């Protein structure tokens, strides 16, 4: 059994924290990184488990925010303390907090602690009860009020609930803290708490070499193959940190003692040469590095070219509160990352709250924070004008977003239910001339695709749900696609028009006058996977690749050219005898030269 | 306007926060350079990752002055309001701030004229960046052109020789290819001077830039 769970002490500052912590674990200035320690419990109960709760005594300080949701993890237990000197005001200026472990770790419990009960409105316990308790928030599982810096009966009732709540994680029931473990990885934990005595304090990191003579010189059974998935499990425990992803040169360093790293990664923003190269590379993998925050905060008056309502098109995106280290990555995630066309470097205007990048009058993007009157929620306005160009440049954004909300923060997505993230749209039935844009629900919009139009209540006016959404109706690619249904001749019921077995879904049909192959990609999922395919699929224009002809959306579909002889497995498997020698030598350049231009444009073919 | 204190008053109260003549009272409050507020700009540069960086695609042009004048940059941000098009119809975009415009159309089309200081010198800059491309000449001459004009419309002492002339107009070139980089700077009345030939060249004479990539508005380019 793996008796170790992670405490995390979130906060907000000039609030007792690392003096709370210092009182809990009775080891009798600012903090800087994360303070990450541990200590370990003794259960005076018969079932005396020794645990170590690895606590993480986050800092308070707004500066080092963007760095903080990189090591809040769902296997963990949160608390939260609020200062109640302060009191009935600091329990709703630690609402961010709350919102952003809702955001990151859904399902983990978390303990408010009021500090500062010497002096001074316990009324706050009231607000505590009726407004923290289960509005869109990561389920208040107790509350104490407790002195610091003199050890107490509340001191000990709170320390006491800690450690219940510990053992009573259970996600799903899991009971997390006494799963099993094999014992070559409690092994490997042994030896590297051994190693940290045994590394220079100035640079504690270690080597993957000398990590493997430790494993040889010890009895470890670990295999090679045994290693990564081994210490990935340390690494959720808060042992050793490392990242075996090779997109960065790290995967060779294992960071040992990770209290020191974070301790100088965040030493940069109040303010070794060999690895100077790594340095600033993990250094960006903090998103670091130009330092995004510190940005000034203040939006830059910008007179855009177009005004209007039918030139432009608005896409609101409401959260309560923005997450925790959001903007950060976003805006690192657009860098450059996002050109109109398939070269040029466009204009940009860096701020901590906005990118504006900027080709031309008429191929610009602006995602950008903006505030409305009696509305406490946060909004992240994108505008951009109603050419191809532009709608491109929407497409590319949104699936940029969505991709960031899917990979770092889950708990906006999940349906509880008002989703805690709403996507709007802005129209305007009114011509554009007039104003008050109206806003309608994306959700909404995309249920209205048994249409190609949007009508209001007056059917005389009608706006097409291309300049609306030219994501949900494909028309943000290039070189319009639909695939004008009254000309098409598919039945998608029959098992009699498959193309064959075992080709997915592909079935035969005919359109504009050919047979042609359609695959039916239609299934519980949204448009991203039939998007994302379509962008690759939509500037390829090789003869030695199955050309795209059309795709569709009631239902999803693509129509692509149909092979009239079959795969070649066929041919292989029933007539060997048509292959000459002259035909087989034809078919292996052309399958060169298809695999020559897929490399050439830097796409790699991984199965074949 | 009679008893001007009242005037006076009456249109400094907005600073600090007769419906017939509302209009009236808008035209002379753009008189005095107050409408959009060009104060109050949150006076910080945003960061501005220009396209095209290097020394050959660009041209700068700095404006030494002791101090900014009094009201200068207000007066400077509302003459080139819209009133400097690259060609002779298309709106182009704008970041305004209490030191800079930064108008833009097209990555080689652009403009941006903003303070800006250098270490060891208390003296005062008006760096103009510029793409060395045809539409960015243009520019280039139109911005100088409405510069000296506020100069000796508003501002006359900074232009009469004592004599320092406490004005002193750069160029920025690079004879080292503009792959390499402290951007030598020549003083403008001398390069005006050394209109004799069509050419600048140092000390070394295997290398020479024209004077029409350094100074468009002297070389009729
Ligand atoms: N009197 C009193 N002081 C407290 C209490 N809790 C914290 N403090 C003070 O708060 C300071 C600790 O702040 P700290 O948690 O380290 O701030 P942080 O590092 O930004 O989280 C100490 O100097 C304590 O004197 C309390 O309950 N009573």
Redesign the interface.
């Known amino acids: 059994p793996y008796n170790r769970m992670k405490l995390m002490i979130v906060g907000n500052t000039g609030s007792g924290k690392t003096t709370l912590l210092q009182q809990l674990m009775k080891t009798k200035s600012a903090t800087v990184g994360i303070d990450v320690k541990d200590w370990p419990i003794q259960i005076r109960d018969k079932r005396k488990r020794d645990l170590v709760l690895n606590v993480w005594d986050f800092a308070g300080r707004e500066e080092f925010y963007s760095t903080h949701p990189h090591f809040m993890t769902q296997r963990a237990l949160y608390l939260a303390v609020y200062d109640l000197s302060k009191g009935q005001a600091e329990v709703d200026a630690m609402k961010p907090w709350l919102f952003n472990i809702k955001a990151r770790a859904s399902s983990s419990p978390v303990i408010l602690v009021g500090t500062h009960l010497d002096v001074s409105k316990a009324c706050m316990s009231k607000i505590t009860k009726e407004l923290l308790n289960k509005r869109g928030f990561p389920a208040i599982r107790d509350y104490h009020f407790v002195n610091a810096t003199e050890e107490s009966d509340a001191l000990a009732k709170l320390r006491k609930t800690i450690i219940n709540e510990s053992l009573n994680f259970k996600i799903r029931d899991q009971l997390v803290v006494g799963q099993l473990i094999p014992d070559c990885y409690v092994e490997l934990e042994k030896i590297i708490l051994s190693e940290r005595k045994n590394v220079p304090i100035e640079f504690p990191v270690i080597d993957r070499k000398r990590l493997l003579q430790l494993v040889r010189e010890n009895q470890l059974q670990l295999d090679e193959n045994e290693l990564p998935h081994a210490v990935h499990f340390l690494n959720e425990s808060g042992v050793l940190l490392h990242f075996q992803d090779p997109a960065l040169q790290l995967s060779d360093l294992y960071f040992v003692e990770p209290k020191w790293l974070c301790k100088i990664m965040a030493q940069i923003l109040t303010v070794p040469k060999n690895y100077m190269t790594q340095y600033f590379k993990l250094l960006e993998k903090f998103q670091i590095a130009?330092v995004p925050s510190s940005?000034?905060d203040?939006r830059?008056?910008?007179?855009?070219?177009?005004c209007e309502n039918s030139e432009i098109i608005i896409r609101l995106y409401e959260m309560p509160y923005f997450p925790m280290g959001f903007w950060s990555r976003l805006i690192n995630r657009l860098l450059e990352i996002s050109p109109y066309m398939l070269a040029?470097?466009?204009?940009?205007?860096?701020?901590r709250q906005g990118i504006y990048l900027?080709?031309?009058?008429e191929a610009?993007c602006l995602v950008g924070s903006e505030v409305l009157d009696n509305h406490p929620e946060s909004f992240l306005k994108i505008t951009v004008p109603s050419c191809r160009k532009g709608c491109i440049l929407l497409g590319q954004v949104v699936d940029h977003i969505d991709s960031l909300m899917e990979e770092w923060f889950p708990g906006l997505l999940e349906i509880d239910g008002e989703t805690l993230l709403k996507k709007w749209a802005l129209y305007s039935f009114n011509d554009g001339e007039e104003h008050q844009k109206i806003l309608l629900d994306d959700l909404m919009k995309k249920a209205e695709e048994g249409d190609l139009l949007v009508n209001p209540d007056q059917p005389r006016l009608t706006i097409p749900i291309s300049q609306i959404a030219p994501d949900l109706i494909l028309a943000d690619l290039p070189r319009n696609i639909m695939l004008n249904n009254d000309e098409l001749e598919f039945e998608q019921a029959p098992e009699f028009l498959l193309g064959d077995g075992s080709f997915g879904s592909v079935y035969r049909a005919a359109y504009e006058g050919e047979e042609v192959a359609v695959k039916i990609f239609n299934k519980h999922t949204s448009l991203r996977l039939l998007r994302q395919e379509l962008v690759v699929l939509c500037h390829l224009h090789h003869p030695s690749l199955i050309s795209l002809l059309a795709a569709g959306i009631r239902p999803r579909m693509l129509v692509m050219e149909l092979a009239s002889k079959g795969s070649l497995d066929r041919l292989l498997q029933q007539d060997k005898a048509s292959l000459t020698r002259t035909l087989q030598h034809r078919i292996a350049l052309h399958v060169a030269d298809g695999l020559r231009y897929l490399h050439s444009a830097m796409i790699i073919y991984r199965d074949l």
């Open positions: 130009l940005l000034s203040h830059p008056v910008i007179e855009l070219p177009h040029l470097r466009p204009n940009r205007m860096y701020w900027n080709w031309s009058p610009y």
